[PDB]
């Protein structure tokens, strides 16, 4: 009896969740901004194509002076682009080819990688000895390792497949927070401007936005249909940007706790990949398993322009911290540098 | 070529050392044979890799060929999440386990655990990534089910059997229902072998299977096929 | 990270004479090596240059086909033979440490010396000595023949320090970096073909030969060097 009461106690909050959501509503976010003028046409071109990948391209980031750039792929490599004239800085080889996700650290210092050994492993790229050496291992996850993004110093945190996310400690090499809640799958991290606040996607269609310091759930948004695959912020960082495996995009947001925004067409049955926002926050751009990218307009519905340069699965997307480029990388072992 | 700056120069020099480093590596990767081995809870897995956190790649050699087994058993998450990771391996390494018409799951007492073991090799052999990698099926503990079969009939595992309850054909039986899951009878074949626990013939099967393989792709890509 | 470098000595005119550095202590097949060689009149010139590809190799147009330099990866070993020695090639001789990508310290680490006796754009300083005073700051001047500023906007101008019985060491690369291990008083500007270095506050060890260098294109000339005492 007991446990029937506390569900359905569970069950009355939820439904006054609900309520006090469809109570602060009071006109959609197609309403407000239909006045506005449209973006129109938005065409880009490649200016580079980044050759030298034999395998799908899993992962991608860029460095915060939007020049230099780390990819990660199925062979086994993790590459250091220089966007402006293609060199290769660095070519690092894993110990596992297994990777699916890296990032690059915001002072350029070190970079990080993981994937199907659960282990995320940090890479010191300015030594006194002139190679890339591995600084240090975190190892504790039971669940694939699926993102992981540095903080602003000596800090990072990593969402994995077993339901859990954590905040680690380079310095040391243990988990300093511990974030549970997820009853599925985390594939995608996204952190605040401000590195206060981040946000974890499941495959429950659930997104959670966590506190850093304090280590605890503070909102939970709900509305898809599948697994979640991509997640990133509003440059202002009060907002979300979802992608899921039922072709739709939603925009919600953190202040309001309500979905505001589909971006979703007819026309498209797969899946989303990743998700990126533009410098301003106007151009929406997410990859797709059509083979092609689209950027869509925020603020409205309509699309606003195609990136159709690839012949393969387009896994991960990224725009530069100046916004001067997107680069895209695909499961033909080709990044492009669209502009 | 000529506007760069010495720097610039050697730069893009150490570019082309880092390409012609990834070529050679890839080179050298492209003539290793990769080898997906899956299976089901207590299929015999252990003893297949005896006798020849995440994921356990195991490396060995037989007569100049070099083959990598991705073990993917003990990681317990969402197969549809990672599955398209091995899209590209040259073939799968199915191990079931013929005394298994007589367990049951310690989850629940039904369903005898065989048809939960047909029900991951209907998942796996029709997948969307797998639609042309062949499979390397090995029924294991055949010598236990030649006791396990002389005392209990097989029609407990299945209620439509009609035969003799000799292991002669009830391994042919077996055999049978596990092939008929495949619905692309032409672009991948199931390469059946009746193992032992104390068998020295696995490898050796196993090489002349992918050397198989190795050949249909390459006359699938030459046009010849 | 360090290069031991030997083959010096007394020799006759007209012989010859191998010079042999060894490294320890860094992947020395990834690192461009040179030869940088300074006479007793305190004048550093550059002399040679092999990449890490072991090819792009660059001599001075004041010796070229009468030295070699090579480079063995397995020993980890840099070889100059040195033939037809004249009366004019005495000096001691340093091996220097150089990688090249984008952001790179491409004069970061020097050697140890080579005593060695036998029996184009030029780059200007100011002046041969500056009086010091540790209250004020202290400035120095460089001047060119034409602009470092390339078109893709580094101006290819480094900074040196030699202090007495020691090896030059790196302070400001591109006119406007600086090293590893070098205090943050040091600091450069200029534009066009007139350069500037400040130190801030003068220390014991700031006092020593200061030195120019400019690697927009080959050969390499360095200044003449400013005495601070």
């Known amino acids: 009896s007991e446990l029937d009461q506390l569900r359905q106690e569970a069950e009355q909050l939820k439904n006054q969740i609900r309520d006090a959501r469809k109570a602060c509503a009071d006109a959609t976010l197609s309403q407000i901004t239909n006045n506005i003028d449209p973006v129109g046409r938005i065409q880009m071109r490649t200016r580079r194509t980044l050759r030298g990948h034999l395998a799908k391209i899993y992962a991608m980031h860029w460095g915060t002076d939007s020049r230099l750039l780390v990819s990660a792929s199925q062979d086994g490599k993790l590459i250091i682009w220089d966007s402006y004239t293609t060199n290769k800085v660095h070519a690092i080889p894993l110990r596992s080819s297994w990777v699916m996700t890296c990032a690059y650290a915001p002072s350029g210092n070190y970079v990080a990688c993981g994937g199907l050994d659960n282990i995320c492993s940090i890479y010191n790229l300015k030594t006194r000895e002139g190679n890339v050496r591995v600084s240090r291992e975190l190892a504790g996850h039971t669940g694939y390792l699926s993102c992981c993004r540095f903080l602003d110093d000596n800090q990072i945190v990593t969402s994995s497949g077993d339901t859990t996310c954590a905040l680690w400690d380079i310095e040391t090499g243990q988990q300093t927070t511990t974030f549970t809640g997820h009853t599925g799958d985390v594939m995608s991290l996204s952190l605040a401007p401000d590195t206060r606040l981040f946000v974890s996607g499941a495959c429950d269609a659930s997104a959670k936005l966590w506190d850093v310091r304090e280590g605890m759930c503070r909102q939970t948004f709900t509305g898809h249909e599948s697994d979640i695959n991509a997640i990133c912020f509003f440059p202002n960082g009060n907002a979300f940007a979802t992608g899921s495996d039922d072709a739709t995009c939603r925009l919600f947001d953190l202040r309001a706790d309500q979905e505001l925004m589909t971006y979703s067409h007819d026309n498209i049955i797969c899946g989303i990949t990743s998700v990126s926002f533009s410098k301003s926050g106007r151009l929406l751009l997410a990859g797709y398993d059509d083979f092609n990218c689209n950027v869509w307009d925020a603020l409205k519905a309509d699309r606003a322009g195609v990136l159709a340069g690839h012949d393969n699965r387009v896994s991960c997307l990224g725009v530069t911290d100046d916004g001067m480029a997107v680069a895209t990388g695909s499961w033909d072992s080709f990044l492009k540098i669209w502009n | 070529g000529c506007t760069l700056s010495a720097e610039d120069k050697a730069a893009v020099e150490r570019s082309k050392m880092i390409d012609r480093n990834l070529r050679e590596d890839g080179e050298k990767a492209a003539r290793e044979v990769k080898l997906l081995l899956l299976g089901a809870g207590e299929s015999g897995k252990s003893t297949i890799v005896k006798q020849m956190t995440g994921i356990v790649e195991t490396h060995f050699t037989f007569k100049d060929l070099h083959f990598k087994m991705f073990d993917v058993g003990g990681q317990r998450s969402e197969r549809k999440k990672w599955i398209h990771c091995f899209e590209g391996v040259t073939a799968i390494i199915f191990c079931v386990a013929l005394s298994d018409y007589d367990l049951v799951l310690a989850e629940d007492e039904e369903m005898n655990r065989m048809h939960e073991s047909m029900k991951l090799f209907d998942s796996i052999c029709n997948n969307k990534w797998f639609t042309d990698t062949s499979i390397i099926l090995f029924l294991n503990k055949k010598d236990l089910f030649e006791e396990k079969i002389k005392k209990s009939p097989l029609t407990i595992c299945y209620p439509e059997y009609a035969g003799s309850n000799t292991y002669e054909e009830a391994a042919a039986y077996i055999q049978c229902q596990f092939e008929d899951l495949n619905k692309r009878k032409d672009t991948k074949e199931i390469y059946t072998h009746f193992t032992c626990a104390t068998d020295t013939k696995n490898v050796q099967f196993v090489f002349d299977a992918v050397t198989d393989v190795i050949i249909k792709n390459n006359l699938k890509d030459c046009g010849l096929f | 990270v360090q290069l031991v470098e030997s083959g010096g000595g007394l020799v006759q005119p007209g012989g010859s004479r191998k010079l042999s550095c060894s490294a320890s202590?860094?992947?020395?097949?990834?690192?461009?090596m040179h030869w940088v060689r300074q006479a007793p009149e305190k004048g550093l010139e550059w002399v040679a240059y092999?990449?890490?590809?072991?090819?792009?190799?660059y001599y001075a147009d004041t010796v070229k086909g009468r030295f070699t330099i090579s480079r063995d990866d397995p020993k980890n070993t840099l070889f100059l033979q040195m033939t037809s020695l004249r009366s004019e090639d005495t000096a001691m001789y340093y091996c220097?440490?150089?990688?090249?990508?984008?952001?790179?310290?491409?004069?970061?680490?020097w050697g140890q010396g080579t005593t060695l006796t036998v029996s184009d754009i030029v780059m200007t300083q100011a002046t041969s000595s500056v009086p010091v005073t540790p209250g004020e700051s202290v400035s120095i001047s460089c001047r060119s023949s034409k602009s470092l500023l390339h078109s893709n906007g580094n101006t290819y101008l480094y900074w040196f320090l030699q202090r007495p019985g020691q090896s030059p060491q790196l302070l400001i690369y591109?006119?406007?970096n600086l090293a590893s291990g070098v205090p943050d008083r040091f600091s450069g500007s200029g534009s066009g073909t007139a350069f500037t270095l400040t130190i801030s506050r003068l220390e014991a060890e700031d006092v020593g030969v200061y030195y120019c260098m400019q690697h927009l294109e080959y050969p390499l000339t360095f200044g003449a060097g400013t005495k601070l005492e």
């Open positions: 220097v440490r150089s990688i090249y990508y984008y952001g790179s310290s491409p004069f970061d680490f």
């Open positions: 591109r006119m406007s």
């Open positions: 092999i990449s890490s590809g072991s090819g792009t190799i």
């Open positions: 202590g860094f992947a020395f097949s990834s690192f461009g």
